[PDB]
């Protein structure tokens, strides 16, 4: 069942590109990896899971008070745009670029209703990649590789 494992690979990550939730930084991040660091996508990922966790976290706390500091907001939103940027969380990104203009306009209620969307988009992101490294991990054990 390698062959059906494979089949399902490809369907399950075109799926994830054409809806948006990953684009073409998450292709340069395979670049990088080969047979002689086969894991360096998976490290790269949970490095990702481990920051934007303990951002939110801040965030859902900073923007839940009667007043907000915009500042400090803005700054830990702009580095959650870049690390889901980098590996190609595109609706992480555009979420916290979204995030980022309510900030600047000042918005308590935007704000709050976009951080409301960013986590949502994290964790989608980060079960449906938790799906793809599975799958892979079971191709990869059955003798198979991971196509493309």
């Not at 976009?114 to 599975?134: A, G, I, P, S, W």
Request: aromatic share 10%.
């Amino acid at each position: 069942e390698v062959g059906q494992m494979r089949r399902q690979w490809v369907d399950y990550i075109k799926s994830m590109f054409m809806e948006g939730f990953l684009d073409g930084q998450f292709l340069q991040l395979q670049q990088l990896q080969d047979e002689n660091n086969p894991e360096f996508v998976f490290e790269v990922v949970s490095l990702f899971f481990d920051d934007s966790e303990r951002i939110l976290k801040d965030l859902s706390f900073a923007v839940d008070q009667q007043s907000i500091d915009f500042k400090k907001v803005d700054a830990h939103v702009h580095q959650f745009k870049g690390s889901s940027a980098s590996i190609g969380a595109q609706r992480v990104k555009n979420s916290c670029v979204a995030f980022r203009n309510f900030c600047e306009e000042q918005n308590i209620d935007a704000c709050r209703r976009c951080l409301q969307q960013v986590k949502q988009e994290y964790l989608l992101v980060k079960n449906k990649l938790e799906t793809l490294l599975r799958l892979e991990q079971q191709i990869v054990a059955a003798g198979g590789s991971i196509p493309m």
